[PDB]
Design a protein around this ligand. Structure first.
Ligand SMILES: C[C@H]1CCO[C@@H]1C(=O)Nc1cnns1
Lengths: 412, 412
């Protein structure tokens, strides 16, 4: 048998806010976090906008000295992680520290740090590379530094599954608890790839919206005028906890994590198949994992990146999985507002899925002015929709055809 | 309920050979794969040698047209995975493709590729970044590309836990099979961090041996004259298989994976604790997971990186875990010959640990001329030691204080 896993703590940096409640306020108001990128000459780039974290103050979390050693993606990961642990009320002791672990991931990791040390290397040679280059850039250092700061001796690892990282991180952390490898996990992801290499690299593949005249309208999932995703920065962290452990200490429980699904498309390196067969197997895997019938699903936080082939694939996959219930559930893309946080996308979207359960509201898909051919589901166009939500899904479909689905249910 | 997991296939690129048997012959004969690096000018660097993969032909596996788009770490990952799958005898069909997944990891991933595209961005501009920069560089694309070429639709993911990556990838893939998430997994890791940023960054931290005048003698685990690790490239892949699934198809079984441990040190970003307390916790978890008396352990493939603090920490951990039996078992570091493959270290060493079981021989620790203070165990100095091996343990320890132990035993 399996132990039940609940959410007792959440943390976030997003383009909408420096914590969960500010971010969630933005989401329910349909506000965009997308804007031209500042303090960076993007003259030579086809995309000049994205979702930046605005007014982040790392000294709320770290000494200036410890922050100087760590890539922005690590700083953002630690910020969400510290918020989430604080939010949980959890007290680490010698009696429980071996039962508390971390799985914070990233899709792309330390590009900004890699960029600046490349500058040093090419200009002045290798003796100007920072001593903290490696440990300050590698993806497992959010898990590493958090475990050191809080004395966490439980399973300590990091996933990197591109745009699926946060969803897989939360899911596999839930498995650790369910099968008794840990009582508590801090799970999620962080990302900061709005450097030249990120904007340039995605730009070279012509994957990015180039709607530079109206950045806030760039991200328009399922709209006929969409022209690729918007690159965004930030982090999500959840405190995952065994139910009896949560009840014994009187924790506030936001919701229950009931289901986790994984699948591989085995199709293309960057493009999903048109019928979304892989996303369909992954959602079916997640519902079977949760012992739920597709009919019980009320809300889906779509991957919904605003790529032509991705958006249409997800519709095909929802209609395939849900049949005559596909129109009854509400499905929205909060990427319409946040843009695509890549490896942190699944983390902040799991948090939005949990908050949809708490507040009984489907977040909007903003900019959905002209649904495309066969995009005829309840996509929650323009404005938030209060409704009954007992069961919420969060999907992530990333490069390499790697898919994740989380299933959350109301707890009472 | 928890299923048993066996090894039915292995594959490798190492500094000692372009497959497993050629690499293993090198291990048993005490041959070094460490040499001055030829693929770049290192005159400005304080370390000018490492374990290069010699004479690698990507056209044994992939079209030149596809290989051109991929970092060497992905090429090396695919080579090893392809070897392991062929070696397994497994045939992928519509009946089983949903039950076969892949977990191939990396510590750093496509650093060469990111550096070269960084040079294009800085010298010319963003218009010269390869359209293949992202899918050709990010860590999850070994798993991605492998699933696309073989049609693997099972769990598809990648770990990045620095020098522990290979051990964690193999352990967590076993858990997937153990718990019914898959019946087959291709798991391990790949690394190619020998670019300017890699040799420069580890150099900046003064973590590397600078024995440039005698590179084959640089890697000297537990030797009093050791001065840091030797940086090495390559890949290890194993096919992990549910036992009854293996029995049902008449698979050749190399050995059984009976134990997996993880722990965090929660000590330091980069230094291990002198007492090996996190390594001891990790091995004890692994031995309890295997249902073993620690006196059943015959052979340990140590992390044994040839750092002053790392090597002594391991002795202390082994003495704390095994007490008087610490004097009866054999422990060696194959990093004495291969150098440190970082994220691939745990993958190649898991394979050496299985071959130690097949051939009943402890590989040597070469260059152990003057064992250091307290390094008084059977460290198999100089020469391979034929001996009874029923149970073999493989340890990895990484930046972030992240620990992994694998336990293998002979299968009857
Ligand atoms: C000893 C190894 C390497 C050369 O031949 C063997 C092999 O498996 N080759 C493969 C090619 N494609 N898939 S496997």
């Amino acid at each position: 048998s399996r132990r039940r896993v609940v959410i007792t703590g959440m943390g976030m940096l997003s383009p909408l806010g420096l914590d969960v409640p500010s971010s969630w306020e933005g989401i329910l108001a349909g506000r965009s976090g997308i804007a031209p990128i500042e303090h960076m000459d993007l003259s030579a780039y086809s995309t000049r906008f994205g979702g930046s974290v605005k007014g982040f103050n790392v000294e709320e979390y770290l000494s200036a000295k410890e922050a100087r050693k760590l890539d922005l993606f690590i700083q953002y990961g630690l910020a969400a992680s510290f918020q989430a642990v604080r939010d949980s009320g959890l007290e680490v002791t010698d009696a429980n520290r071996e039962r508390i672990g971390v799985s914070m991931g990233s899709g792309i990791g330390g590009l900004t740090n890699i960029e600046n040390n490349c500058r040093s290397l090419f200009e002045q040679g290798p003796r100007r590379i920072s001593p903290f280059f490696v440990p300050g850039s590698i993806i497992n250092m959010v898990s590493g530094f958090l475990s050191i700061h809080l004395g966490l001796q439980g399973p300590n690892y990091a996933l990197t599954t591109a745009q699926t990282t946060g969803t897989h991180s939360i899911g596999m952390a839930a498995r650790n608890i369910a099968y008794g490898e840990a009582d508590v996990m801090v799970a999620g992801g962080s990302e900061m790839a709005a450097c030249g290499l990120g904007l340039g690299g995605f730009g070279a593949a012509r994957a990015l919206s180039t709607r530079n005249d109206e950045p806030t309208r760039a991200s328009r999932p399922w709209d006929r005028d969409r022209d690729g995703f918007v690159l965004s920065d930030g982090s999500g962290a959840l405190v995952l906890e065994e139910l009896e452990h949560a009840r014994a200490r009187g924790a506030r429980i936001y919701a229950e994590l009931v289901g986790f699904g994984m699948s591989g498309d085995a199709f293309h390196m960057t493009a999903p198949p048109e019928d979304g067969a892989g996303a369909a197997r992954c959602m079916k895997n997640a519902l079977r994992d949760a012992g739920l019938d597709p009919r019980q699903v009320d809300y889906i936080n779509a991957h919904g990146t605003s790529t032509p082939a991705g958006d249409i694939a997800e519709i095909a996959a929802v209609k395939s999985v849900f049949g005559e219930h596909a129109h009854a559930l509400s499905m929205s893309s909060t990427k319409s507002m946040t843009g695509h946080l890549l490896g942190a996308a699944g983390a902040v979207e799991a948090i939005f899925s949990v908050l949809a359960l708490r507040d009984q509201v489907a977040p909007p898909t903003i900019n959905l002015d002209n649904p495309d051919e066969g995009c005829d589901l309840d996509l929650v166009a323009h404005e938030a929709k209060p409704r009954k939500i007992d069961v919420a899904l969060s999907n992530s479909f990333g490069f390499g055809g790697t898919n994740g689905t989380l299933v959350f249910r109301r707890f009472a």
